[PDB]
Design a protein around this ligand. Structure first.
Ligand SMILES: CC(=O)SCCNC(=O)CCNC(=O)[C@H](O)C(C)(C)COP(=O)(O)OP(=O)(O)OC[C@H]1O[C@@H](n2cnc3c(N)ncnc32)[C@H](O)[C@@H]1OP(=O)(O)O
Ligand SMILES: [Mg+2]
Lengths: 40, 160
C-alpha cells in the first residue's frame, strides 16, 4: 500500500478541489519537457 | 539522441547493475525490486534506456492507480511513486521529460476510463522543489510528501 490511498486533510483536499476548478497553466519548463517528448 | 522511453517489456533483459542516481534506496529498488513488482502487477515500470539490444537503463519511473479521499467524496487518480535519473544524464532535462511522458500516459488513460489527476511522491526537499518547478500543487500537513497536477492541466500541455 504505497501511495495508492491518498487520505487528504481538509486543507490538502481544498488545494486539489481548487486545482480541478482552476487548472494550472503549464509553465515554460514543463512545455520544454513536452517538446523533447515530441522529438522521441 | 540514442535514448528512448518505454514500458518495461515483459520478455526482455535490461542492464541495471551499473545504474547510480545518487540515492541508494532508488538504485536498490531498480536492481532488486522493480522487475518483480512490474511483472506481479504491483506497479507499472517505465524505463529511460539507450535503445541498443543491450538495453542500458539510465532512468525510471513507476505508476500505480490510486484514489484520494478526505476525512469526517473520492477522486480516482494515478500516482508516480518513484522517479530516478542516472548521474551521467543529470543536468540534461531528462527527469522532467520522464514526468512529461508520465503525464501523457495518465492523460491517455483518463481519455479511455476517466482519471482526474496525477499525484506524486516527494520524499526529500530537492524533489519537492523539482515537481513544484513543473507546476505540481504542494499538499500540506499529513499529505506533505504529495503534490498534485490535474488531468485538465496535462490536457493543456499537449493541446495548447
Ligand atoms: C538529494 C541529494 O542530495 S542527492 C539524491 C538525489 N535525489 C533523487 O534522485 C530523488 C529523485 N530525483 C528527483 O526528484 C529529480 O529527478 C532530480 C531532483 C534528481 C532532478 O533530476 P534532473 O533530471 O536533473 O532534473 P530535470 O530532468 O528537470 O533536468 C535537470 C535540470 O536541467 C535543466 N534542463 C532541462 N532541460 C535541459 C536540457 N535539454 N539541457 C540541459 N539542461 C536542461 C532543468 O531546468 C532541470 O532543472 P532541475 O535540476 O531544477 O530539475
Ligand atoms: Mg537530466
Amino acid at each position: 500500500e504505497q501511495h495508492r490511498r491518498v487520505i487528504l486533510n481538509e486543507e490538502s483536499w481544498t488545494r486539489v478541489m481548487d486545482a480541478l476548478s482552476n487548472p494550472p497553466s503549464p509553465g515554460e519548463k514543463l512545455k520544454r519537457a513536452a517538446k523533447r517528448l515530441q522529438g522521441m | 539522441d540514442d535514448l528512448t522511453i518505454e514500458i518495461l517489456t515483459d520478455d526482455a533483459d535490461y542492464d541495471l547493475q551499473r545504474f547510480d542516481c545518487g540515492e541508494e534506496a532508488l538504485n536498490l529498488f531498480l536492481t532488486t525490486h522493480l522487475v518483480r513488482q512490474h511483472r506481479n502487477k504491483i506497479l507499472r515500470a517505465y524505463i529511460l534506456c539507450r535503445n541498443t539490444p543491450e538495453r542500458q537503463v539510465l532512468g525510471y519511473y513507476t505508476l500505480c492507480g490510486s484514489c484520494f479521499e478526505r476525512a469526517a467524496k473520492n477522486i480516482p487518480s494515478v500516482t508516480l511513486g518513484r522517479l530516478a535519473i542516472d548521474r551521467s544524464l543529470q543536468g540534461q532535462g531528462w527527469g522532467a521529460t520522464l514526468v512529461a511522458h508520465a503525464m501523457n500516459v495518465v492523460w491517455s488513460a483518463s481519455l479511455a476510463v476517466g482519471i482526474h489527476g496525477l499525484f506524486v511522491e516527494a520524499l526529500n526537499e530537492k524533489a519537492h522543489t523539482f515537481f513544484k518547478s513543473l507546476g505540481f500543487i504542494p499538499l500540506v500537513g499529513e499529505n506533505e510528501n504529495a503534490l498534485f497536477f490535474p488531468t485538465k492541466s496535462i490536457e493543456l500541455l499537449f493541446t495548447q
